[PDB]
Design a protein around this ligand. Structure first.
Ligand SMILES: Nc1ncnc2c1ncn2[C@@H]1O[C@H](COP(=O)(O)OP(=O)(O)O)[C@@H](O)[C@H]1O
Ligand SMILES: Nc1ncnc2c1ncn2[C@@H]1O[C@H](COP(=O)(O)OP(=O)(O)O)[C@@H](O)[C@H]1O
Ligand SMILES: [Mg+2]
Ligand SMILES: [Mg+2]
Lengths: 168, 362, 372, 151, 213, 372
């Protein structure tokens, strides 16, 4: 969790809080319309350069910013394939309820497992000095959950094995 | 310094404007409505709304001399408002002939004409023809390349500083016959036909704002790289004498206002305004006017207790929510003068996404 | 956000109001009184029954009778009439538009709660309702999490010790002595003074007397001894008729029955001792927290000077090491309703309702399935 | 059918990156030779236990461009090695004794080094990033967000 | 919804038992469709042998007969009069079927009217099909005659044949079983390789109702 | 690698930290507790299971179960939960980036070792791990190389004589009497004076009583005779309930169970006779040195005056011609940890790990043929 992820976590925090200087901006190709500019990528003069934060080859933090919208996709550790399946299913459930989260994408960008997307409106109404707090909190708690759920798998396997075998 | 919170708007306000007598002020909100407020003793109260537009209202500016209000919105149309003798206001559409959403509007210091920024590659300048009672727009499309993010007039009433979103600062002559007389020779130039490239200067990001000095012989612009550059022109087709650039360690700046002939106040995503003291030799950040790192046996009311249980239930903390130190809670919109003779300003107002309209008393 | 009716059908009053209100906006006695005279007079549309404040005002010729007896409903038709009055003539809201939140005393008969939910669903066609417990809502209103809540209303007195979150169901002590029994004892002891009160109207009158001319003495034997020099104890009360009453030791003798239930002939410990017994019934660790968190509740506990006597008695009973703190909020009269309103406007609560479809498919046992 | 086959890409040529940032006046051979001259000095300074001076010398000139990929990779490798060959306790003095533009180059290149962790050591880059953000401020990261793509 | 209506009707009469299963069985052996409500009420008032008493035996209430009443014809009428159930819908079923057929392309209206297939377990009410066919036939005759007197010429008209069959209760299952036996059915299924290749959104493009994109 | 993890997963207490440090970063009771009530409250963050210090603090409404019984783990689910707690909640370091060191009592079933190694390698994916015996760790901590080690803890007491750099596995004596049995005996013999302790919370309270009051006498008969004139031997303790209890001859009686195991009805030699037999089972030429080096380790050996009495008994048993010396450092409570850290911070120890690449190529049986 922490006491363990200081430099990576603080680098992500600083980069995210620096990249969240959004602004209301309409569409330069369609009139009377405004769209998240990071997702469309049609006007390159307002798209800041993509930025990547990493701690190890299996952990990355792609930070793509724009004038109004910021997309922030991360990779979390999957040491063994058990954690691979657990991470995939858990993060699918996480993104399946993006309606009540307001900063999630229903489908992550390829080569990743989750992609946040903070449009202007979220910074407009929701005070954003704890969106990053939620970000880092999730980035550590997710590994916590994966470990706990694999423990629960082992426990249930033990219980069912005992229940089956005792009734000879 | 000292600041007083005038009002707490329920919704974000990207703009504000006070009348000449500083009696009532107009402000914009997130939706197509435009809000009016008037004093109620020691506070302010709602006055009326304008629903003439259709899409999000972008900018609003108040003419102090003639007491008129113009409004340019995302719906690619501009409305001009003048109060009737009884007290109500009369709407008036202006055909901007734009192809994309407008972004920023300003009245000339003589209030005869107003220029409109736009994302349709162009800038529209409109005046009034008394012979036809019409507003006609002219497009400035020769040197422009990207979206207009800011506008700034000149005391000579002819030069117009345009802050474009192509990492280049633009100055153009908006002089038009039948409205303005011939202007005097200027350090910026003398021969000033309509739509001439007065000057072009670079930057390290989108030019959020531009501003001429009160003396009218300088330009100050801020990119998105949290750098404010002060330009000192020398002669037409002649590089400036000195291009002073001050680089800060905070979030990018948004709008620039000239405190006096040698002072600039500017605020941005840092939730605070700054001050620049200097001269032709150089400039430097002087002071954080927002107090900096201020970090600012009894019965419990029913509402507080209910809030504690709601936080406990929806949460796992039930603790104070933000307690943010800065007076503002989100990005600031703009800085405009409040009182004082030109070159002598001690009070200036500001608005932000939090809706706070915080007056600043130097 | 999702306003819900909060009806606390207490044994003496029916406090009602919407969820989230600071105080209930509908308080009136739970009385249904029919006329008891021939009424040769014709006209004026004389009704056949009066409920609430109208009954209290016309009590001169009305046979008032409470529809609830020690927390247990005994006059289901009268209680349906009272509920109809509360929904329509006092709150002026359709029952089928907002959910309701009811309360009932612990250890109550199960048929009471079953019939309560059955009536409120079949008859008033309410969307959903919940049956909470008075002590839990009092804990809500006190803004705490632990402590043993002493609740003493008009009907029954009960203690439900609650640690952090968890409530011990084996340490709930319920004592039937309550405000109605105190009023009856006051009626009995006013006879020895000379004044006679018999009928129901005189019962309401003596309840009004006890409302403002009674208190709990900090010490009992010394107070009775000093009542011999009757100087600062007695003070007159103006009876409705006009003749003046003058009560001396009766002022503090009738509330003493709470601490000495043997006065009305009950082989039960007083409230001060049953609180200690309920505390001792719990685990050895949570007792220290329960000692310092004593949440007084109920309308009976509004006697001026009850908290001091209770604290003194509990301090005497308990070991002398740790401190005994008693909590007597100035608004503890409506504490149950305050807690109910606080609980109703909680996001997690909407999943704890009893939806109309669920009741229709489950029968009347869904209240036992879900509420408790 | 006719819904696909977009035409907006050709009728109006959108602004391309060279229209935003100034073009590189230097030639490819010139910058390649300059970097090939600067790198061995940095390696020698690392060898003689003077990594601070080596990093300062290597920081004086910084290459860029879309046609200098290979030489930029060699420069980045040398920079990463030089920075990883620096004792941690002496970092604050180095950071405080720099100009804003030099610190901007430092943070830009360490952040690009963070982008390829399959060949580099991420721990030292993260530690340097933490210390520079703590000392200089957030404006360095702002400049990173508003720097040239080829940098 | 009509089961909830039947339960409410048992509720208002204060029957000894009002369990939902009792309402379901009351439909199972009691309810039938009627031509019109006022005439049926008059017939029920006049005719006294239409007053049945269903034996409940809920859990322990032996011989607690439930005296059924007007529900037997008031319940099925919701289909041909949907105002009773709620205000969310107000168009009677025959009128809605008429609108569905009229909105269809002109050439297939004869085929739509000629063959009408009932399905589901809630269409097993007696005289349901007869009443539906009568109402639809009356409405189509009204429209055709209106056109005729507008123009002044006779026509052969269109017939309506509401069809009920021996597999009304589980027509969906029987059709699925008959369809699955076709060899071409296997090719139409979503193979597991397709799912693992194209992702979990392989079946999201809704196909039968409406055109995608 | 900078530092290596190390965890002393003892039966009663668990000690964790980094190699080379001289202070346990994390010590919490090896307790996993589950709630045993309803929770009528709303919210409160209902947590399914509390482990460690949280369980110790909230034992009022929890039932506690020790995963390790007599040194053998019996609840692998709880053991995994405790290891997860150590890794994430208190030390909060990623297991995959730190080699770990574990400790297991001698003569335990091979199933325990194999399962622990497999769990650490697969469920936590540690880079490398090692298993070491308590006696070797005690010798490493004390700085010695020769001397029989008495390791008395919460779960099991064992003796492992070790000559200079060599251990005699055939002379290892293991006794299943330990702190848990002493606590149970104290609970049993506190009943004779009236006080009764039943629930697990009472068990923890009795453990605290043994912590603060129990001590070992010098001569049992003389101490009992002195206690007969019960004047200046009794003490007092304060339960969290506030009640004061008095302790008497059972203050020192229950520590004597170590020297007289017949008190708890088990036929075995005391902790001095077992040491004497263990020394005599060794070679004759090394007894003259093992006598001079008696090492006391573990939490149980913290009783006042235990060392003096043990020295007296060993001197009585052994011939007088050769002196007997017993040593017990004041920090012997964490001697096992100190030795583990010293071993883990050794350059010559770097090649004695068991890497994952080594483990997956040989199966979980590799620990038997490498660790010991
Ligand atoms: N200020 C007071 N002084 C004395 N007795 C009071 C006072 N207020 C209320 N009571 C008594 O409390 C009773 C009302 O209790 P109540 O709060 O209605 O309990 P419940 O709601 O459970 O019926 C009345 O019978 C009255 O005698
Ligand atoms: N000062 C003390 N006096 C008496 N008993 C103690 C003292 N300290 C610890 N104990 C007992 O020793 C036990 C500690 O066990 P511990 O040595 O941690 O086991 P392990 O060696 O398996 O980790 C506790 O259960 C406690 O009962
Ligand atoms: Mg009550
Ligand atoms: Mg041990």
């Amino acid at each position: 969790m922490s006491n363990t992820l200081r430099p990576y976590l603080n680098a992500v925090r600083s980069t995210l809080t620096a990249s969240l200087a959004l602004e209301e901006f309409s569409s330069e190709i369609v009139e009377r319309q405004s769209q998240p500019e990071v997702e469309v990528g049609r006007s390159p003069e307002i798209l800041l350069k993509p930025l990547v934060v990493s701690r190890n080859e299996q952990e990355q933090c792609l930070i793509e910013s724009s004038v109004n919208s910021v997309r922030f996709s991360i990779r979390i550790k999957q040491v063994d394939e058990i954690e691979r399946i657990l991470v995939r299913k858990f993060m699918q459930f996480l993104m399946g309820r993006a309606e009540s989260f307001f900063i999630l994408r229903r489908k992550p960008v390829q080569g990743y497992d989750i992609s946040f997307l903070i449009t202007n409106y979220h910074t407009e109404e929701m005070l954003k000095h704890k969106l990053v707090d939620f970000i880092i909190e999730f980035m550590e708690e997710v590994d916590a959950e994966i470990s706990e759920m694999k423990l629960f798998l082992n426990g249930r396997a033990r219980l069912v094995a005992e229940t089956y075998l005792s009734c000879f | 310094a000292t600041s007083q919170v005038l009002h707490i708007l329920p919704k974000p306000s990207y703009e504000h404007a006070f009348n000449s007598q500083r009696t009532e002020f107009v402000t914009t909100t997130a939706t197509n409505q435009v809000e009016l407020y008037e004093q109620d003793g020691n506070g302010w109260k709602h006055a009326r709304t304008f629903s003439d537009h259709d899409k999000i209202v972008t900018c609003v500016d108040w003419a102090p001399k003639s007491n008129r209000i113009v409004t340019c919105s995302q719906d690619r149309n501009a409305y001009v408002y003048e109060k009737r003798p009884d007290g109500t206001w009369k709407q008036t559409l202006v055909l901007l002939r734009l192809n994309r959403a407008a972004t920023f509007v300003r009245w000339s210091p003589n209030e005869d004409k107003f220029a409109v920024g736009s994302g349709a590659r162009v800038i529209s300048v409109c005046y009034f023809e008394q012979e036809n009672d019409w507003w006609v727009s002219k497009h400035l499309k020769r040197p422009l390349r990207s979206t207009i993010l800011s506008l700034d007039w000149h005391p000579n009433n002819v030069l117009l500083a345009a802050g474009c979103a192509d990492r280049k600062a633009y100055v153009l002559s908006a002089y038009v016959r039948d409205v303005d007389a011939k202007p005097e020779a200027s350090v910026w130039g003398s021969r000033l036909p309509f739509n001439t490239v007065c000057a072009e200067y670079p930057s390290g990001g989108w030019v959020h704002a531009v501003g001429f000095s009160p003396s009218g012989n300088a330009l100050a612009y801020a990119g998105h790289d949290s750098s404010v550059t002060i330009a000192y022109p020398s002669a037409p087709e002649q590089p400036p004498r000195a291009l002073i650039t001050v680089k800060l360690s905070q979030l990018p700046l948004r709008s620039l206002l000239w405190a006096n002939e040698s002072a600039i106040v500017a605020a941005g995503y840092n939730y605070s305004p700054i001050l620049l003291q200097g001269n032709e030799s150089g400039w430097a950040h002087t002071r954080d006017l927002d107090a900096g790192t201020s970090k600012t046996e009894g019965p419990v009311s029913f509402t507080a207790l209910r809030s504690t249980f709601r936080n406990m239930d929806l949460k796992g903390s039930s603790q104070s929510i933000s307690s943010l130190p800065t007076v503002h809670q989100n990005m600031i919109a703009t800085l405009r003068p409040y009182a004082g003779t030109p070159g002598n300003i001690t009070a200036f107002t500001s608005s932000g996404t939090d809706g706070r309209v915080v007056l600043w008393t130097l | 956000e999702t306003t819900a009716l909060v009806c606390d059908n207490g044994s003496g009053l029916v406090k009602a109001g919407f969820a989230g209100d600071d105080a209930p906006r509908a308080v009136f006695p739970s009385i249904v009184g029919r006329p008891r005279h021939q009424g040769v007079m014709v006209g004026m549309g004389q009704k056949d029954s009066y409920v609430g404040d109208e009954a209290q005002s016309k009590r001169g010729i009305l046979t008032l009778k409470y529809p609830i007896e020690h927390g247990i409903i005994t006059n289901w038709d009268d209680m349906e009439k009272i509920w109809h009055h509360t929904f329509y003539n006092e709150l002026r809201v359709a029952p089928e538009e907002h959910p309701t939140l009811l309360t009932e005393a612990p250890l109550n008969p199960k048929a009471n709660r079953e019939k309560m939910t059955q009536i409120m669903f079949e008859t008033f066609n309410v969307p959903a309702m919940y049956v909470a417990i008075q002590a839990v809502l009092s804990l809500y209103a006190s803004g705490r999490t632990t402590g043993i809540v002493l609740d003493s209303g008009d009907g029954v007195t009960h203690n439900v010790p609650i640690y952090e979150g968890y409530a011990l169901p084996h340490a709930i002590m319920r004592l039937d002595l309550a405000g109605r029994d105190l009023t009856d004892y006051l009626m009995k002891i006013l006879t020895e003074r000379g004044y006679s009160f018999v009928t129901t109207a005189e019962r309401e009158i003596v309840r009004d007397i006890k409302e403002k001319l009674c208190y709990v003495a900090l010490d009992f034997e010394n107070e009775m001894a000093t009542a011999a020099s009757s100087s600062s104890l007695e003070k007159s009360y103006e009876l409705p008729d006009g003749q003046v009453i003058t009560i001396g030791n009766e002022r503090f003798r009738c509330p003493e029955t709470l601490f000495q239930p043997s006065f009305i002939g009950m082989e039960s410990a007083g409230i001060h001792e049953t609180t200690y017994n309920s505390i001792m019934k719990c685990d050895i660790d949570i007792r220290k927290d329960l000692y310092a968190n004593n949440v007084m509740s109920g309308g009976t506990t509004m006697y001026p000077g009850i908290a001091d006597r209770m604290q003194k008695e509990i301090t005497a009973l308990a070991p002398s090491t740790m401190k005994i703190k008693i909590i007597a909020p100035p608004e503890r009269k409506y504490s149950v309703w305050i807690g109910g309103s606080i609980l109703a406007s909680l996001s997690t609560f909407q999943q704890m309702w009893i939806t109309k479809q669920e009741y229709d498919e489950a029968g009347p046992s869904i209240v036992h399935r879900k509420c408790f | 059918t006719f819904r696909t086959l977009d035409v907006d890409s050709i009728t109006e040529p959108v602004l391309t990156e060279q229209d935003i940032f100034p073009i590189r006046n230097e030639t490819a051979e010139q910058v390649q030779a300059a970097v090939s001259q600067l790198i061995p000095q940095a390696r020698s300074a690392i060898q003689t236990g003077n990594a601070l001076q080596g990093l300062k010398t290597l920081l004086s000139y910084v290459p860029y461009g879309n046609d200098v990929q290979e030489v930029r990779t060699q420069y980045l490798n040398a920079f990463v090695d030089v920075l990883s060959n620096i004792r941690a306790a002496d970092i604050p003095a180095f950071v405080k004794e720099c100009s804003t533009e030099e610190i901007d180059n430092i943070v830009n290149f360490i952040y690009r080094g963070l982008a390829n962790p399959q060949a580099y050591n991420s721990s030292v880059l993260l530690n340097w990033h933490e210390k520079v953000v703590e000392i200089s401020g957030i404006g360095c990261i702002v400049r990173v967000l508003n720097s040239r793509p080829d940098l | 919804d009509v089961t909830y209506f039947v339960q409410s009707l048992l509720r208002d009469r204060n029957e000894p038992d009002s369990s939902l299963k009792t309402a379901e069985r009351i439909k199972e052996e009691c309810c039938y469709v009627c031509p019109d409500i006022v005439k049926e009420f008059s017939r029920f008032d006049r005719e006294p042998d239409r007053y049945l008493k269903y034996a409940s035996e809920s859990i322990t209430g032996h011989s607690t007969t439930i005296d059924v009443g007007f529900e037997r014809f008031l319940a099925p009428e919701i289909f041909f009069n949907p105002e009773i159930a709620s205000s969310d819908f107000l168009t009677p079923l025959p009128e809605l079927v008429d609108n569905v057929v009229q909105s269809s392309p002109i050439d297939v209206r004869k085929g739509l009217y000629k063959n009408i297939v009932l399905s589901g377990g809630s269409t097993l009410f007696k005289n349901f099909g007869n009443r539906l066919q009568r109402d639809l036939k009356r409405i189509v005759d009204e429209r055709i005659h209106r056109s005729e007197m507008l123009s002044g010429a006779k026509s052969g008209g269109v017939d309506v044949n509401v069809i009920s069959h021996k597999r009304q209760r589980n027509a969906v299952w029987f059709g699925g079983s008959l369809l699955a036996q076709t060899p071409e059915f296997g090719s139409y299924c979503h193979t597991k390789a397709d799912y693992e290749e194209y992702g979990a959104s392989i079946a999201r493009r809704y196909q039968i109702f409406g055109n995608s994109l």
